[PDB]
Amino acid sequence: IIGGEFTTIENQPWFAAIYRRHRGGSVTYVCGGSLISPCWVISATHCFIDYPKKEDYIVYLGRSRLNSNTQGEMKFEVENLILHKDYSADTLAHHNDIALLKIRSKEGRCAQPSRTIQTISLPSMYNDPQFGTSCEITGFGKENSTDYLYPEQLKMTVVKLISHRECQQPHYYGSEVTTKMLCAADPQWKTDSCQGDSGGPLVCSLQGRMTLTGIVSWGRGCALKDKPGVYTRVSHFLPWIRSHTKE
Ligand SMILES: N=C(N)Nc1ccc(CC(=O)c2ccccc2)cc1
């Protein structure tokens, strides 16, 4: 996250931190995600496409720091890793960038809600906030494009939703952005998502209710003028989500 503020997991209880195990014992951060139900975490497919082996992943809930433990955190294994079959990546754009991870503790249990672990609500069919609406994003991503390390503490910032007409302008992303995506940015182009924030949630207050409206997917550079962050439009994947989470 470029700009913004450092935060704690108590203020973003649905945030899931995903790591990948490596030969030897090193565990590196891979992507963010969101808890949509006790047993399910939603993220982005571009995070796992190159290494689709569920056994090599670890999911943490209730965690505020990148490399240290947090009181109340819970560790999970991945029972099932579901990637979108029509995922694809062009020069910049990533299509159908959404994924589901069924989690389970060593005892075989799902998440137990607490002050630091809570689910986030899914949107209704084609029910997105009006453009111009302020929403928040959260992640352990880079603070500057020139950085090569990620911050140790979780961050968050607020960005505004941009219309498809504006985001499709030539100086923006032209025809690369589709109706299955959502653009969001800071009117001053000072804050934005960045490398390492992928999979994370774009949360918007829709009718007094915190709703998971987007998933960090792609964008040209970070916090550059006329180059908004692009998010997977969750409301357009409800069918896919429901069919896969059932049984
Ligand atoms: N202007 C932005 N907001 N840009 C931006 C948006 C999302 C990402 C997610 C990410 O980390 C990633 C995506 C594809 C491949 C590898 C990593 C990165 C930068």
- Count CB atoms within 10 A of the CB of residue 104: 16
User: Are the C-beta atoms of residues 133 and 87 closer than 8 Å to each other?
Assistant: no
Q: Is 171 a catalytic residue?
A: no
User: Are the C-beta atoms of residues 141 and 150 closer than 8 Å to each other?
Assistant: yes
For the chain, the distance separating the N- and C-terminal CA atoms, rounded to the nearest angstrom, is 36
Residue type, 112: Q
Residue 218 Cα to ligand 1 middle (Å): 4
> Does residue 216 have its Cβ closer than 6 Å to ligand 1?
yes
Entry resolution in angstroms?
Answer: 2.0
Domain ranges for the chain: 1-12+120-235, 13-119+236-247
Q: Compute the CA torsion angle 63, 66, 70, 73 (nearest 10 deg).
A: 30
Q: Is 97 a catalytic residue?
A: yes
Q: Is 84 a catalytic residue?
A: no
User: Are the C-beta atoms of residues 227 and 183 closer than 8 Å to each other?
Assistant: no
Q: Which of 34, 43, 46, 186 is catalytic?
A: 46
Q: Tokens at residue 148, please?
A: 């090569």
What is the 3 state secondary structure string of the chain?
A: CECCEECCHHHCCCEEEEEEECCCCCEEEEEEEEEEECCEEEECHHHCCCCCCHHHEEEEECCCECCCCCCCCEEEEEEEEEECCCCEECCCCEECCCEEEEEECCCCCCCCCCCCCCCCECCCCCCCCCCCCEEEEEECCCCCCCCCCCCCECEEEEEEEECHHHHCCCCCCHHHCCCCEEEEECCCCCCECCCCCCCCEEEEEECCEEEEEEEEEECCCCCECCECEEEEEHHHCHHHHHHHHCC
Distances in Å between the alpha carbon of 224 and those of 19, 159, 182?
A: 28, 14, 17
Residue 27 Cα to ligand 1 middle (Å): 21
Closest ligand 1 atom, residue 185 Cα: 3
User: Are the C-beta atoms of residues 135 and 234 closer than 8 Å to each other?
Assistant: no
Listed in sequence order, the residues at least 6 apart from 134 whose beta carbon sits closer than 8 Å to its beta carbon are: 158, 159, 160, 204
Listed in sequence order, the residues at least 6 apart from 14 whose beta carbon sits closer than 8 Å to its beta carbon are: 34, 35, 36, 118, 119, 120, 201, 212
Residue 108 Cα to ligand 1 middle (Å): 33
Q: What is the largest CA-CA distance in the chain?
A: 53
Domains 1-12+120-235 and 13-119+236-247 share a fold: yes
Q: Which of 43, 198, 217, 235 is catalytic?
A: 198
Residue type, 132: G
Listed in sequence order, the residues at least 6 apart from 120 whose beta carbon sits closer than 8 Å to its beta carbon are: 14, 34, 35, 36, 201, 203, 210, 211, 212
To test the pocket of ligand 1, the residue of 176, 195, 230 to mutate (highest count of ligand atoms within 8 Å of its CB) is 195
What's the CATH code, domain 1-12+120-235? 2.40.10.10
> Does residue 218 have its Cβ closer than 6 Å to ligand 1?
yes
User: Are the C-beta atoms of residues 233 and 57 closer than 8 Å to each other?
Assistant: no
Task: Give, using CA atoms, the residue closest to atom 11 of ligand 1.
Answer: 195
In this structure, which topology does domain 13-119+236-247 adopt according to CATH?
A: Thrombin, subunit H (2.40.10)
User: Are the C-beta atoms of residues 223 and 186 closer than 8 Å to each other?
Assistant: yes
Bridge partners of 210, per DSSP, are 205
> Does residue 186 have its Cβ closer than 6 Å to ligand 1?
no
